[PDB]
Each structure stands twice: as structure tokens, then as C-alpha cells.
Amino acid sequence: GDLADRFAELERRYDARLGVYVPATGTTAAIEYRADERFAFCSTFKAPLVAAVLHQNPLTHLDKLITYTSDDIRSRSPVAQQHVQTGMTIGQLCDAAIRYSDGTAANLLLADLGGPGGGTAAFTGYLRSLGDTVSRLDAEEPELNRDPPGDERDTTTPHAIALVLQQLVLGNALPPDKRALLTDWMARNTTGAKRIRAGFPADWKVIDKTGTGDYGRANDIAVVWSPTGVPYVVAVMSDRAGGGYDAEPREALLAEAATCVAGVLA
């Protein structure tokens, strides 16, 4: 119908593949467009990664110091760059991973979660513990952003990652104290202003984690709250694989998809 046609026009205009999922609520039907097609996580995985590390350990574990060297920085790492000599705490790594999408921070958290070699498997296992049987993480940073189109490695679906974020932020996957850390870090993020946030009116609260990658990949996952406090979860994923590995991502595509959703939820 109308919404499907609107989303299709976005795909034509941006020369992109778009995926959208918004779970049903008691008064709204699910919004679904390519919701069960796989799309690369890119940095969206960092949100559930932090949740996994929070869940697996006591609060005092956030103060554990992790050391590393400049040879460990193999991805865009705006925070970890500055702390090679000192190390960073698990807590500082979580902050960096969410708020700066720091790649080395995410790799170090993976290693904390699953050991050397076992991180991506352990991360995927955490998603399994949340009832996500579809998503998979296979490589670390930066390779996870760079898989060829069609490859199932390092992919989720709008549907799957929406339900994950829903459990983490709106459900009881984490105890409230841990849930609030995750939520707060997402609230203070420095990369999502032009994505789902840009599709919702200013009196709606939005917290999000972005992802960006090769093949014009641009994703955003969010929880939003209406002016009266009614929550919804919004996943928007995109790629422009037709343009090749260096295709330009289009944040505006996500903002527009979000505007369509906001129009329905208003």
C-alpha cells in the first residue's frame, strides 16, 4: 500500500536498498520493508556488544584496565588512539564504542567478552540469549564493515536488530542499573543527529546507534519516545551496493525513512 510505495520511491531516488522495521505496539501495526532481508550490521553491533559486556560482569568490571598497542589500532578509533600508553577501562571502552563508534574499543570489548579468537562468536551468542536466532558477527573491525553484498557474514535484519534493541532498552535483558548505562551512552552519542533523529519532531526523545560501511552502507537503530512517553523501536538499514565498495552512503535516506515512520506514529 501507501507506505510500501513511499519506501520503494526512496529506493529509486537514492539508488539504494532500504530496510525498515518498527515492532507493533498495542495500538500500532508493525512497519516492515525488507524487514527480514540481511543487511550488514556495521557499527550498530556496538550497542548490543556493550550490553553483552555489561551483562556478563559485575559493575566493578567497568574499572578493569585493558592495555593494547598502536598495532592493535586497525580501524577508525578516535578515543583508543589517545590511550595506547595508559590503556582504557572496560567502562571507557564502552563509552568510546557507543559514543564515537570507536573500532579498536569494540575489538577490545569483543576480546573481553570472548577472548582472543572467540569474541565474534560470544557476541553472536549474546544475541542468541536474547532470542535473536538470525544475526551473526563473524569478523572484527574493520573487516565486519567490508563484506561483499550478498554475503551473510556480519549481517542482521531490521526485524532482528529492532527486537534486540527493544529487549535491551525497553525490556529486562539487563538489570535497571546496567540498562541505564547503555541507554545513557546512546543518549550522548556523537554520530546519529542526521539519521533517525532527523525524522522525528523535537519533542520526541531519540537514542540511537549508527552504522556506516562499504557499498554505501548506512544504518541506524533507535528507541524513540513520543511527547507523552510512548516508546517505539526503529531500525533503518541501507546499502547502495550497485555503486561498488566505494559507493557513497546516504544518511538522508535514513532520515526520510524515519520521517515516514514518524508520520505514521504521530
Numbering used by the authors: 27 to 57, 59 to 83, 86 to 145, 145A, 145B, 145C, 145D, 146 to 238, ...
What does the paper say about this structure?
pmcAntibiotic resistance mediated by β-lactamase-producing bacteria has become one of the major threats to global health. This phenomenon has substantially reduced the efficacy of β-lactam drugs, which are the most commonly prescribed antibiotics worldwide. β-Lactamases (EC.3.5.2.6) are a group of enzymes that can hydrolyze the amide bond of the β-lactam ring, thus making the antibiotics inactive. One such residue, at position 105 (standard Ambler numbering), is suggested to play an important role in substrate discrimination of class A enzymes. Interestingly, BlaC, the β-lactamase from Mycobacterium tuberculosis, possesses Ile at this position, sparking the question about the evolutionary preference for this amino acid. Mutation of Ile105 to Arg in the β-lactamase BlaC simultaneously enhances activity for carbenicillin and the ability to evade clavulanic acid inhibition.
Comparison between BlaC I105R and wild-type structures indicates a minor repositioning of the active site residues with one important difference. The newly introduced arginine at position 105 adopts a conformation that differs from the isoleucine in the WT, moved away from the active site. Consequently, the access to the active site is broadened. In principle, this would allow for easier accommodation of both substrate and inhibitor molecules, but it can also lead to an augmented dissociation rate of the initial Michaelis complex in case interactions between active residues and substrate or inhibitor have weakened. Furthermore, we investigated whether any structural changes in I105R would be detectable in solution using nuclear magnetic resonance (NMR) spectroscopy. In agreement with the observation from the crystal structure, only the 102 to 106 loop, harboring the mutation site, experienced large chemical shift perturbations. In line with the observed MIC value, BlaC I105R showed improved activity (kcat/KMapp) for carbenicillin (2.7-fold increase) but impaired hydrolysis of nitrocefin and ampicillin (4- and 3-fold reduction, respectively). The positively charged guanidinium group of the arginine side chain might act as a “fishing pole” in attracting negatively charged carbenicillin molecules through the carboxylate group on the C6 atom. However, even long and charged residues, like Arg, can serve as a viable replacement, as demonstrated in BlaC.
